[model samples]
Target: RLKIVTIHQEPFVYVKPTMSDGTCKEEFTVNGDPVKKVICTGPNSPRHTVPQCCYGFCIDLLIKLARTMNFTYEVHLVADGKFGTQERVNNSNKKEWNGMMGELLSGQADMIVAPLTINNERAQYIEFSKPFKYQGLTILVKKGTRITGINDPRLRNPSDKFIYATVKQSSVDIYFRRQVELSTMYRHMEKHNYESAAEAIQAVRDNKLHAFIWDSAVLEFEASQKCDLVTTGELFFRSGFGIGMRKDSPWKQNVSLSILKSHENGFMEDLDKTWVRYQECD
Candidate 1:
């Protein structure tokens, strides 16, 4: 079974507990009342090799490929919260990778099936399948906010009153830096930062932040659930999202072929409709 590593990014990769028999059970009393009890053993319980759980889009897509390609897989989360990046180790000049990418480079995972973007830097060390989705950078603000676009007058001028938030060590962070360099407003605006998208969104809801800049797909999913948040502005940058694999992995062709077939058979389109288009806001 191929080992896959991922982070908990909603609508893309998330964990859901399941029963031991691989069926979700809803215990009900004779009177039809539900039993409010924890049935399955906890994560610490050694009843099985791993916790019985379900996964989101990428995970589901991996399953489809596995079934079609006649392979098996085991999924796990990255121990460190980072997605992936090369950094100098403390007290040494050596550069090492950390996060999901690190898992692949260290040979801990066969592949990564999350919404990892295909970039030149990463491509040097790993291979990428044909892009399954395309996404862009956009601004997410509280609903009814006057800031409509990146070119908004408020954003063009230096101001401490307007606070923009973004996740550290993300594409959004890179985009933010680029914007700051390109526009005086971005450079002058106050910045609030978080380690994750969820935390940045929470800051907006709490009125501690005014705007968030991030990936369009992720922000769209987050906005759907948050009545107070809305996405605005034109796409600042666009890139393709692809599956990550080892540079010399033999299964790359099989996985790519499966993805292509899924597209031809309308499975990929259906997944988009279900996971992206019809996402529930409530």
Candidate 2:
């Protein structure tokens, strides 16, 4: 049996409570067969579920692709869906290589389903599957923030003290930092990195920060909820989220094919509808 790992998050993968025991349950089947098992590393606050968590949109699509390809596997989650910590980041590139290196060298997990950006540095250690989703960076702000775009004149005024937050080692954080150097209004610009994007966003709501940067697709999942935050519909950079495998895993082709098949067969659309609907309420 193949083993797969997943963390808890909304619209991707979360634990469903089973009446048998009060403890969180983390297994699910796609077509009358068990697909993956949840390995609870610990409790994660960014995730809505305790002892169980799900992946983000890109990760969810990766899981569905794996299942459709008829490859059996188990899934493990870190409880919190995040990466690039002090312990992991010190040794690798700040962008795409750090988190993936941990998974590769430690052998704790086989593949990553999170919204990993595909880039040259990462390509050196591992191989990426075909691009399954379009990705771009975006700004998340309170419902009525005046700033329109990163290049807007409002962001050029020296008195503007907007604070932006993003997860450490995130592609968004890197992009935002570079943009700050080019603007004059951001003299007081503050950039903070937390364990997860959810935490970074919460900082904005609590007034600890004024704005946050995130993936456009991910922010759509957040905005779809009609929550207090909204996206500026601007993308800072473009990339694709893919499944990461050891240099040469036999399952690579199988996983890649499943993604294409899902898109062609409309499974992705249906899955998106179901998951997005589920995310709106909680």
Candidate 3:
């Protein structure tokens, strides 16, 4: 009965490869299918799931919400493939939103289920359920990239050569754009952009982009999944991730109430054990 919009990010919502034939051994519990076997050579790459191929922190929560609330939901990857940010329009200085927010705005999806950070600007257009995960902004860079501080001259010098960025037009992107301290970073990032964390992570992997500044939580997850990355410094702009809903959505009270109960019931912790702490190390 609910249609959700999401993006594939490791430790949150993801698809993993398996040996062909769609079956294998990996004893565990997960929302939908935890089947460890599935051929991934097709164009779909593991998803955005048939509801049978995706699993992660949010997915498990989705399962809880669905079962407890007695409803089935479908997950749709945002059409524009962005998380959402405000861009200016005309003389009114009006802001235009794109990405999953736009997807929610257009009624293309009933709910948004992803690592969406909750902020005032975003809340203006979309309603948020109580945050499920607490997080904040930080910096990530290649494993040995020298870091003394946020705007380290080591990374800032040779601006033409070294650069950094976050998900193009994301909540983090907006945060960087608004602050004078962060403006310089976004200045270079404006030209050098990325749409997903993996893409930016790859840029750092390739040594093209020297650093990626974004949520410590997302960067931590991305860094945990791979060996070559590290999030330096500490957290800032502390906030948490929340579910997005339409202004008049009837499910708000119910969904948020369930979220509060999940923590007390320890389901949230179990999900963290399976997904959040499910990591790979060097």
Candidate 4:
């Protein structure tokens, strides 16, 4: 039997004690002990938002892979989000990126199926499986704006000055900041500021900010429902979302192959359709 640990967040992953229909129930048992079930564990009302859960997209895929491979594993919830406060509490001294990943390294968890970004920095530590999703950094602006692309001539117009904004510590901000440093004509991006993607996009809509950069996947979901925001025509760069495993784990190869097979069989496509569908501008 395998004891797998996971975290939960919204759209990507979330946990609630009761189902929408108010029918399904949650139960727990510890290693052959009698099962303990509950109707609602966290909160009876909509206010409280903590309960055991699994990944939204990645976990669904992981579950199918486990069943197909006949792997005996029990997935346990680690925290609500990527780095929940509980995990932080457990490893207070190592409360950083390295500490966040220590749960897996210490054998407390088997793998991390979160929507972790694959970059050179993270690649140095844990071994990431093949990418299951592709996304890019994009800028959102008012619909009437003349901006065609990140490299559009309008943005470089002598009379037009653009101040881009993005969330601090976000990939979108880093990518756009780097682009500014590399370009001569688009150097006006030096006026960039930091704000949460939602706030930045809202500011642009309210005519407070000129532009904002954010993840394509997130923008995809937002633009589908929100009217004021839209992703850029140009994609800054491409990156993949992958499941992370320890370098010492023997399951790395099998997990990687499982993801590959799932992708080959269109499992990822189906997942996108079922859970993450959002209409956006082309």
Candidate 5:
């Protein structure tokens, strides 16, 4: 059985508990390595709930890969809640990786199935499957709000009632850090900080925040799932979203071949449509 490391990145992976008390063996250590299990209910319970309840795009792809490749597996959530970022070891040349990357490199995970971006930095330490999705950055605002793109005067010419935000240490965060104009605009990003996309969306729904910046694909799905949020502006970049696997992993070729074939057969396109729930908001 393979161990798949993943995270809750909406349409990619969604998790919900049937009961608040859904019991499973909580995070325990094997040889001092930490592990967490949130939604699973153990066999002793007569309730008969699924031991590991999860759904959405990645799950669909995972199931198909397993059935086709003939492997059983378990899902492991990254403890650090990051998509994995790179940093140099203190005063040393070797790189330090955290989040899912750390899990994979540590041999705790056989593969990572998430909305993980295929980028130059991450590729140095891992290999990725053929991109299952191509997406980019965009702005999300309240239904009636208007903006052309990241440079809209509406955001630059601000209001006390309006502010923009995104999760820290994300690809969006890195994008902002590298740009000059967007870096200046990002100062407004602080007053309304959020740790995750879901919280930022909830803040907008409650009228607590005015606008959020995130991946267009996710915001598109979120906007389609609700009437209150609307996606606007041009996509800033064309980025690939791929399945992550450890460098030199035995399964990488098979998995990559599967995703490549899925892409050519239009399965990935249809799957993206299936999870968006477009009719709900309409």
Candidate 6:
């Protein structure tokens, strides 16, 4: 059986409680009291009930793959609930993988089917299927906020009060630093960092900050759901999202081939229509 590790990322994968018959439960608890308990079933031991497990765009992709490849699989979340990144442990010469990447490297999972970005550094140690989606970085701000494009005159002028926010330790942070040199506004901008995208977006909604920069797709999804916010500025640093597997693993070719087949059969396009284009901001 294939062990697939994923994370609870919205529009990508999400967990919903379900009844034993594979129906969604209206309420896990009734009036703050336990009404019933969910029982998960799967190939793996300590099985997860249908409701306890996640299902979404990525999950759908995996399901399609399983059907086409004629294989059975199991799903689980990353032990640390992170997307995974390379890090150096203190006093240790070896680099450690954290999050879903960690699970794959440690032999806990056979594949990763999530919104994992494809990067050169990561590709050095892990294999990635051909890109399933292309995305870039963009800025999100409250609606009606006066901010032009990245080249706006207001941003170039230091007299304008400008405050922007982003998630700490995110890829956007590194992009911000690199892009700052190209814009005068960023050269003298005040920066606020949050631990997560929700916090950064909240700061914008509360008028505590002027803007928040993040992945274009995520910002677009947030803007579509939030009437108070909108994404602006041209997308930058385009990248692709791919499924991850262990480097040199025999399954790598098989997974890549399956992704190609899915693409040819229009399965990938259908998923994008359902999960992405339909949810785009107007």
Best by TM-score: 3
Candidate numbers sorted by TM-score from highest down? 3, 5, 1, 6, 2, 4
Question: Each model's C-alpha lDDT?
Answer: 0.71, 0.58, 0.76, 0.57, 0.75, 0.70
All candidates: TM-score? 0.80, 0.73, 0.84, 0.62, 0.81, 0.74
Give the top-scoring candidate (lDDT): 3
Clashing pairs in 4: 8-80, 9-13
How does candidate 3 fare on TM-score?
A: 0.84
Give me the runs in candidate 4 sitting further than 4 Å from their true place: 1-11, 14-49, 52-55, 69-109, 151-163, 170-210, 278-282
Candidate 5 TM-score, C-alpha based: 0.81
Q: What are the per-residue Cα lDDT tens digits for candidate 4 across 151-189?
A: 665555533465665554434433443554434433444
Native-to-model Cα distance after best TM-score fit, residue 279 in candidate 3, in Å? 4.9
| Stretches of model 5 off by over 4 angstroms after superposition | 18-52, 87-95, 154-161, 187-191
| lDDT, residue 48, candidate 2 | 52
Q: In angstroms, how far off is 244's CA in candidate 2?
A: 1.1
Which 10 consecutive positions of candidate 1 have the poorest summed lDDT? 35-44
lDDT of each residue in 145-214, candidate 1, tens digit only: 8776767766666366888756655554334445535344434432455767777888888888888877
lDDT of 4: 0.57
Stretches of candidate 3 off by over 4 Å are: 16-52, 88-95, 154-158, 278-282
lDDT of 6 by residue, 1-282 (tens): 988888656677766655577665554221253222222232224643233656667877887777767878877766566666567778688788777778898998988888887877678879998987789878899999877766556555534376775664444433445554543343454345565566778889898878776778778877887788999988877887788989787777777888888778888887766666664344
Cα displacement (angstroms), candidate 3, residue 82, comes to 0.6
Model 1 residue pairs with clashes = none
